[model samples]
Target: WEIDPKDLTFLKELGTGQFGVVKYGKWRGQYDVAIKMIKEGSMSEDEFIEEAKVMMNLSHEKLVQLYGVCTKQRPIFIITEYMANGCLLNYLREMRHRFQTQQLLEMCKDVCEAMEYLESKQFLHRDLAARNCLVNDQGVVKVSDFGLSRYVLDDEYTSSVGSKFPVRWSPPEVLMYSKFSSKSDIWAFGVLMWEIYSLGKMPYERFTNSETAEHIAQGLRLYRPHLASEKVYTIMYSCWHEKADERPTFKILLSNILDVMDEN
Candidate 1:
């Protein structure tokens, strides 16, 4: 059911990843929109199914919109609004002069807003890192790639349905075989706060995964430099607390950030 009108015929490659390739193409006489063509045997068939089921219902202003996806062929193709600004990672790497704190805060705010919307509707962004997220030319973050997302209401992560995630941003509570709660997702969200504050750098980049495990096991957290404000650093400390119970939920997180936003 390709509703692409009957006038456009130009297509160009945009980006490539493990599961698919994105291409900017024109449909009918419309402008270029990006389409992700899923590669064969890339993502598990199960995720392929879930991705299809979940992406259609995705509705949030700060989140990416999936116009539609089709899998009639061996490699499915997802058609949606094309974003020209690319992933946040590349932008940060390319931007040399300055990383505006206010702009960064606004982007992080968009991420929290998007995740809060998803969590409210009962979805856990299994993988919540900068690389997977998209930002427009205007610096708004849109959470994309729902392929690895999970819908968690309470702490129930019973879906061997592949709950394991790879995020260098958060502490052990999230990656380890611990209680994968929305609280865990919030911890990742806090790490993201640090990421934007640090100009898109992953928290604890020097530590290896195993070392991170050891540090988390020892009740240690990422130490911040004196240059960083103690108030903002404390948010990361609260999130990385040894007791998972102490971590704040995204709602609580939004409230706290808004409090800081108000004070500043």
Candidate 2:
């Protein structure tokens, strides 16, 4: 039941995952909205709460917006302004069938812009992988999953555990059990861009998680970053450099990615 079913009423479920579920909804008879219903006390709850605190204070066209939250008590219901197209990962997968290179470039550009916005706040998305980005029907990228986000290091960026990030997208340092910084997040974003360009294919699709670790430990590059043009490769390589200092800060990253047209 919507706070008022007479006009803005609940329709149906849009999607569900480990993150929880969302419902397709309407508001004021003229407005369309996406209503995210979070699960109470799930592992993600703590993270979500943290994200809400930070996210609510933010306002950006490229970032997801928090419309409302049901903080009445106990059963906390968080509501965010919704997007129709869903995750960028799914968007890429579905559209790759007909999109040209420029089309992909445009998509990446939108996503990067959102990242740039986050970085402007001295925030690290922590998870910039394609799957976490949401693309609306208009093809705009709405970055999500701030639970993994954190501060960009003032002195340096890294996680205490080294490089143990989420499998394929995790950078070398993260895999090595160190902290992650803005630059590391940029590195992860590069991988995500690759994933977006490749339409959801992981680099070294044949290598298991253990093998990936082994190769990175030896400084054995999987060579995916080398495939793009020099400019593109430069962006990816700089982000994942072994020395955290070598990674480009968000300012540099924004300037670099701005050069791409995002055609396909």
Candidate 3:
């Protein structure tokens, strides 16, 4: 992984990530991009190189485009397409009052399509949330943040012991067993849909993580967001089945959402 310093120009900071900060940048004085500059000592050189290779391997319209990485320098840089509107959750929140239900569905459709592609490629997007998604100026939503994602060739990936998860968005199996599968991702997508419909409100806001997990164990689910139609809420509800196999696949989700669109 290498990049010529002369070809890229840093403009301004965008946001923070696990080991780096994202900045708006220009490539070759032409292409607009986002460059994630890894702080010195954040990762070993081989680790950065391996991650860059994985990023380059992934390609999809609804996934952020990875241009290249500069690993030869002290602070490694991972450059990708620029998302003018930034995080999806924040973007939805700022426009929630004005956007129609169809608009919200469209974003969900974009995410579903992306996840379908990832699922087909046998990748587990362990972290699937609105905050990890990005919206461009064109209103196109793209799934980003592959930091916690893994390439799973099997149906399931057991996580390392004691790994932390974003409790509210995680499935019960994940919270209890550190088991990650496409079905677990489906559960998170349901929480993401709730976030979109609720205009970026956090899930299980009324309960602590321990309480939330207990509620889920007892078969309690989130109530439909006031703005969500019954059909959409039903779809969200279907994703939270205690039995992972009962959860709808991303393909099923995309088809179900399209059916909803046709009804409207």
Candidate 4:
């Protein structure tokens, strides 16, 4: 899709990033959109183009849609479908009590299915969390952030030494070994469930990141949120298993979540 930069009008800043800012905009003076502007020289243009090509090729209902890109100038622009409801964390915080458990299950299931799609494609979403997901006006949750995502040809992407990680949401292996895979994402998925069930409280709230990493390394895990049932907790517990190989796949996760929803 050839999007003329002159036709897009930036409305307001939605979020700030390392490259630039994500802004609310009107495309062609009609359709509402989100434009992520990546400033020049911040990253390799070739890699950005490759990532955009891969994003364009990826198609799934729970994955955000890339409308097109405007890369003919100083700051490159990536256009995507607008999510009026904003990030999933904020949405869940505002509506958690107002929503039924089944409704929460539906949202969690949507992301599970999306992750399953990524698993099938051998793509690793290195940073998976509630804040990285977007919700539409219709309450549809779509996984969004791809800044750390990489196509995993070997099922794992090794993190550079001293690279930052979301400690509270990461598993022991990932924190200690920097080994990222779909299994590590399962660990984050478990934390995402906690975020939804706990009404958006950050995980390991009482501990420092280093302390949280130490605790996880020593076999301590997050407690079940008040809203989660015993079975839901069980499913999440499976994800935090120290051995990544023991974690459930997204397919298994979706099936188990649906079972819980059905039994309720």
Residue lDDT tens for model 1, 86-172: 887776667724765556657777888888888897877766777768877677778876434442221223222233335455456
How far residue 139's Cα lies from its native spot in candidate 1, in Å, is: 1.6
Predicted structure 1, TM vs. truth: 0.82
lDDT of 2 by residue, 1-264 (tens): 113333446788887743357677777755677665555533345555555566667778877776655544534555566678888777777776776656666666777777777777877777777877887778888777654334222122233333433556667777675566676677777787687667667666788776876776676654653225666666666766777787777667767777653422
In terms of lDDT, model 4 sits at: 0.82
Residue 67's lDDT in candidate 1: 68
lDDT of each: 0.65, 0.65, 0.82, 0.82
10 residues in a row with least lDDT, candidate 4: 151-160
Score candidate 3 by TM-score against the native: 0.90
Residue 178 CA displacement from its true place in model 2, Å: 4.6
Model 1 RMSD, rounded to 1 decimal: 4.9
Stretches off by above 4 angstroms in model 2 are: 1-8, 44-51, 73-75, 148-165, 225-227, 260-264
Model 2 lDDT-worst window of ten: 151-160
Error of 3 at 63 (Å): 0.8
TM-score head-to-head 1 vs 3, winner:
3
Q: Residue 165's C-alpha lDDT in candidate 1?
A: 35
lDDT of 3 by residue, 1-264 (tens): 466867999899887765568899899999999987777645555644665566578899998887887766767777888999999989988887888888889989999999998888778778899988999999999998754444222222223222234677788898888788889889999998998888888888878777888899889898899889999999999999999999999999999999999999
Residue-level error in angstroms, candidate 3, position 103:
0.3
